[PDB]
C-alpha cells in the first residue's frame, strides 16, 4: 500500500541526507544527488567512511552490500547495483552496510517479482493455510508443462512464443471483402533492407490472397533474381532451397508472418484489404531473428518440499451461531439486530432462515443452533453458507465454502471476518459475493460452531457416485425453441419438469445444457448424481455458449470442468485473447485456487506471451483489490516465474507507469493546482532527469507490445484541463521502417477514472463490428485500444488526424460539419468520404442505443478527416442513469443529429426525407436486427463481468436492460417498430423536427 | 406530493454518498498508515542493532585508548553514539505521532460506518414511500 519515491514525500529534493549505517558501528551521513547509482553511493561512502573512526577494520566496498526499509516495510536487499535511489521506494533515507551473505545473489534477485507482481514474495511465503501453499507448489506443474512445450523444436518454437502469428481465424473470406481485392489477389510491398546505407530497396508483387508466405518469399526471389536471366528448374532450385531461409515482418511493429497461413488470414493483411491500404512487408534474414531471442531459463523455487463418506450421515443439516465480535451503529437511532443466514449455490436450495432477534448490540450474543431443512447427503458439492449481521438494513455480510478444497465438509468451531455491504446493494443477504474471510482483520468478526461428527466427513468420489447413478436409473421435439431463448429469460416450474423430463433425449440438442442444468434439484442427490453422469459424456459445444457455464450461476466442478475441456478443444488463441477481459473476471467464482480453468489460462499465458501480456496487466489491475488479492497474487507470481525473458519487459513498464502514476499525483493532491503554465516547465522540466527519461525510454507499451515505444517527444507532451490530470504522451517509434505505419505512438494515461467501463465497451464495439462484417454489412467502427492497469489507472489509444465535433464546429451553422468536412475531401474523393460517415454514423448510433451508452455530446464524438466518425469516453455505461432517478426519466435528445444529417444528405436544405436518409435508416435497422439474432452472445458477455465492481454491472437487472434495448418478446417486425418509435422518440434520447423542445411553442 | 419526498429523498441520497466516499477514501489511509507503521517497527528494529554493534566493536578500542588517555579520539568515538541513539528517538517520537493519528482515524471511521448504516434504512423507505405517488403529469420535479 504505497506511491512515490520516500514515505510521505513524492518526491525527493535534487539532493538529500541519507543516513548510512556501516558494520563498524557507526553513522555517517552522506549527501547524495537523488539520480545516483547505488554503485556510485557506495563508492562515496567508502572514501568518507576513512574519515570517521574504526576505518581500518571496515574491508574492500566489494565485499559489501545495502539494506534498508522499503515503503511496503521488508528488509530489501539492494543486490542489483544499476538501481538509483529514487526507484528503490525507500521507506526512510537511511542505508545499513552489511557482507552479503544469504546466497543465491540470482535468486534473491527476485524480489522484482515482488515488485512487478504488486506483492511481495515473502509475504506468501509467511503464510498459514494449506491451500495457498498447496497451489504455489501445484501450480508449478503447469509452468514445467508450458516451458516444456515451447522448447521441443527450439528455434522456431521460441519465435512462436514470443511473436505468434497475428491470425483472425477461419481463412474463409467474406465475399464482399473478396471482391476488393481484384481477380482474387492483391498487391503487396516487400521492403529489404540492404548492407550499406540501410538502403530501403523495395520490391512490389502481385500475388494470390490465399497463398502462404513461405510463397510470398519465393515471389520475391524471383523478382530480384529472374531479372537476371535463368532456367525454370534453375528458380525452382533456388526456390528451394532458399524459401525458408527468410520470414516476413510487418512494417513499423515487431509483428512476424512465422506460420504456415493463408497471407490474407493474417490482421494485417485482412485489415489492409477492407480498408483499401496496400500492406507493406519486411524481408528479413531467418537467423537474424532467431538470433536475438535468448534462453528460455526456467528453475523452481524455495517452495517444493479414520474419515467417513458425505452419505454415511444421517441428519438435517445444523450451524450454530456463536457470537460476533462487535458493529458500528448507536444505540439510540434503531437497536434490533438479527444474524440471517442461508445455505446456497449460487441461487438459494434450502429454503433459509434468520435468527432470534436478540439484539444486545452492546454484546451480540446468540448460542443458537440454526436448524434448516435439507438432508446432508443430498447436498452438492458447491454447498455454501451465506449470511449477514442486519438490522431493524444488511450491515455486514460474509461467505464460506461447506467443503475444503479437499473435499472435506466443515467441522466445529471457526470465526469468519465479515465484509462491509457494497454501495448499491440493500437485498439483505449476499451470494455473488466472494466467499472467505475478510482479510482486514480490523472488522466484524462473527464466530460459528459446525458439527463435528464421529471421524472427518468427506465427500464421495465420482466412481462411487456412478455406481449410485445406474442405481436409481412431436411438438415436444419443438420445445427446443427453449434453447433459442436468452439465458436471463427464466423458466416455469412446468418448463423445469418437462427439461428434465426429456433429459436423455436432450443429449443430442446439446445447446440446452444450460438450461438443462437449471432444471436440477441441486438439493437432490439422486437427480445430481444422474446429472453428473450426464455431463461426464456430453458432447462438447461452441466456445461462446460453453463459457456461460463458466459464469456465476453453473459453480458446479463438474459443470465447469466441461466448459473448461470446451475450451481447449476450440476456442482458438484469438479469440482466446479477445474474451481474456471476461474469462479473468470469470476466476473469481471457482471456490478453490486451484482450479481446471486456471490451469487452462496460465499454460496458455505461458505457450503465447501475447496472451501473457494481457493475461498479466488484466490480473494486475485487480490487485489494489482485496477480494481477489490473495487468487490473483499467487497467479501472477507463477505467471512470472514461468515466462522467461519478459519478465525483464514486464518489469520495465510496471516501473515506468509507476513513474507516471506518481508524477501526476504530485499534479493532482500536492501543490501543484494553477497554471497550465507552471505545471508544464514543472512536467516537462522534471521529465528531463535521469531517472526519468530512463524509466519511460526505450520499453514496451502495454496497449500493444507490438509497437516499441522509443524516445520521448516531450516537445509534444500535454496536460488536459480536467482535474484528472491526464497526460498526453508522445514516443517515437524506433523502428528502421518507423515511417511506414506508426512514427508517432501516443498514449493517453490517466489517473482518477475507471477505465473498466470504457474497456469493456470498446470489446462489445468491436464485436459488433465482427458480427456486422462477417454478415455483409460495412459499417466500419473504431474500437480504439485501451487498458486498465490498475485502480482508476489506464491507458488510452490515441487515434492520429481525429477531432472532436466541437473543436470542428468552433454565429454557428448546422452545415458548418459538413460544409467542412466537404473541404477535406475535395471533389473527387467526396462522395467516398460521405460513405464513411453514413456507414460509420450508423453503427455508431445502433450501438450505442443498444448498450445504452450514457447522455453522449459535442466533445463525445469525434470524426477523423476522412470522414470516420466514433464515440470515446464511454464511462457511465449501461443506463445507470436510472439509478440517479429511478424512473423512466424524459432526456436530452441528440441534437446532433441536425449537424450529422446534413453530411449524410449532402449540404441538402431538406434532409428528413430524402433518398440518401433511407439508405442510412436503412443500415440501422439491419444492423440492430444482425445483433438481436446474435443476442445471447453480449447477454453472456456482460453477465460474466458481474464479478468485477463495476458500479453498473452489480446485478442481473443491470444486464437486463439489453433485453429491453433489443426486442424481449418482440419478433424481428415488432422490434424494428420498437428501434424506429424508440429513435424518432424526441424526450427519449431521440429526434423530431419540432425543434422547440426546451419550452414548447 | 413527490416534490415533498424528493426533497428528503435527493438529501439522504447524496450523503450517503459524501458519506461512503469518506468510508472507503479513509479506509485506504488506515490500511496504508499502518503498512508504515510496520516499516517504522523495521526501521527501529535495524537502528537498535547498529547501536547494539557499536557497543561491541567499540570495547576493545575505547578501553586501548582510555589507558593511553587519548579523549580526543574517545571524544569522536562517543559523538557518533550521540547521533545514533539521538536519531533512534526521533523515529519513535515521529512513530508514536503516526501511531495516534491511526487510533485517531479508528474513532473517525467507526463513526462514519454508524452514521451511514443510519442513513441506509432511512432512504429504503423514503424511495418506497414514494411509490404510493404513481397515481403528461410527470412535473412534479
Ligand atoms: C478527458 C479526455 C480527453 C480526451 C482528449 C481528446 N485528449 C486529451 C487528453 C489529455 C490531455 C489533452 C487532451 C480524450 O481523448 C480520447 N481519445 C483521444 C483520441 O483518440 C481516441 C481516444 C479518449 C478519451 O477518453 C479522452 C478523455
Ligand atoms: C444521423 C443520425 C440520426 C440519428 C437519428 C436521431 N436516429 C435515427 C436513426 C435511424 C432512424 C431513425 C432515427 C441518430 O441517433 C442517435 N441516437 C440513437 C438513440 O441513442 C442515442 C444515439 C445517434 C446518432 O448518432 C444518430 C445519427
Redesign the interface.
Known sequence: ??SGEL?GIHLMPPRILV?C?L?????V?LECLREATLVTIKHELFREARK???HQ?LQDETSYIFVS???????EEFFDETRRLCDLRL??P?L?VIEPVGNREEKILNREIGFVIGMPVCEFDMVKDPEVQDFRRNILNVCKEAVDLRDLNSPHSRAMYVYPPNVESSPELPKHIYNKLDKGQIIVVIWVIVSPNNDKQKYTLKINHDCVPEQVIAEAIRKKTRSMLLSSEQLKLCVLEYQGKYILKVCGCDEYFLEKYPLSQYKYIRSCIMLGRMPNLMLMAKESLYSQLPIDSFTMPSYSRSTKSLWVINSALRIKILCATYV???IR??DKIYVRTGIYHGGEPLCDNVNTQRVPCSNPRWNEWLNYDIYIPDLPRAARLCLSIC?????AWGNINLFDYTDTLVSGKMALNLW?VP?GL?DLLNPIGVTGSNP?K?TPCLELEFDWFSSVVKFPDMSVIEEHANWSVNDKEQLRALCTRDPLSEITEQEKDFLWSHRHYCVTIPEILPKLLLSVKWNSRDEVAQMYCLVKDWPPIKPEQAMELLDCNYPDPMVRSFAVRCLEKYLTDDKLSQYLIQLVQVLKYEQYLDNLLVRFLLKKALTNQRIGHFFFWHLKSEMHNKTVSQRFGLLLESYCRACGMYLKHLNRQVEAMEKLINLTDILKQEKKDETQKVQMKFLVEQMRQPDFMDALQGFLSPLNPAHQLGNLRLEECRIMSSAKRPLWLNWENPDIMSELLFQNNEIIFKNGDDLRQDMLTLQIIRIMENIWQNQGLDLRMLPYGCLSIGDCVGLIEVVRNSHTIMQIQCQFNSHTLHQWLKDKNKGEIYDAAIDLFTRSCAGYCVATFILGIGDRHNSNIMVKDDGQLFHIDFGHFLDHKKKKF?YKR?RVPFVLTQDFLIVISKGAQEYTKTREFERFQEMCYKAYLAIRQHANLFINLFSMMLGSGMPELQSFDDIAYIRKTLALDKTEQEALEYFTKQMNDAHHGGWTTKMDWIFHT | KLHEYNTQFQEKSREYDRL?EE?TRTS?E???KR??I??????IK??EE?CQ??????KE?IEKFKREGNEK?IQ??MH?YD??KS?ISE?IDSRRRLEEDLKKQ?AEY??I??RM??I??DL?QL?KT?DQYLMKL?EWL
Open positions: 500500500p504505497s514515505w543516513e549505517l558494520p563498524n558501528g557507526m553513522i551521513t570517521y573512526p574504526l577494520l526499509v522499503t515503503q511496503e516495510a521488508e528488509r521507506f526512510q537511511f545499513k458500528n451503529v448507536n437511532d434503531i438490522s431493524v438494513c444488511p450491515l462491509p454501495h440493500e482486514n480490523e429511478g424524459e | 461512503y468510508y485506504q488506515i490500511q496504508m503498512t508504515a510496520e516499516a517504522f517497527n523495521e526501521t535495524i537502528f547498529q554493534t557499536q557497543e561491541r566493536y567499540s578500542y579520539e569522536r568515538i557518533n547521533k545514533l536519531r523515529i479508528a467507526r463513526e460506518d454508524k448504516n443510519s441506509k434504512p429504503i424511495r414514494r410527470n
